[PDB]
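REQUEST
  id: r-88c1
  op: predict_structure
  target: Ribonuclease HI
  payload:
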Amino acid sequence: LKLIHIFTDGSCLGNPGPGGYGIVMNYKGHTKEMSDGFSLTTNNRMELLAPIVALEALKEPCKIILTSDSQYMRQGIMTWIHGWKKKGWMTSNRTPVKNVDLWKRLDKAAQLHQIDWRWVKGHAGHAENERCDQLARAAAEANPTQIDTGYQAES
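RESPONSE
  id: r-88c1
  status: 200
  body:
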């Protein structure tokens, strides 16, 4: 297991509005930056999609230290997903969980690695967490045209 340090952030101008994510990944001496934007999404979707894309890009199972700023994602990984699996990914109203498409992808991709999740304590991150924010905000501000096809209306 190679050691990868991953840093992620999502940003959205609006709720909903154009959004983006930023990812920095460091492996030994190397660094890779990744970002993308969407025309209409939410901050919460971009906060999930960042680690999803980072984790889905890894070619084989790794040991990872992944740092994000999102207490929404954290809540998911530490308590909601486990309950959701037992309830058929439905809420207590017996309807599908919000952003279920992304939560399922995150859960699936996370299972393949050994992950040490870290959450930026408001906000004394590493420089890389700044760099994510910059990349995310850049991509959201650049009049992105790509469609987030899992963002649902009223959402």
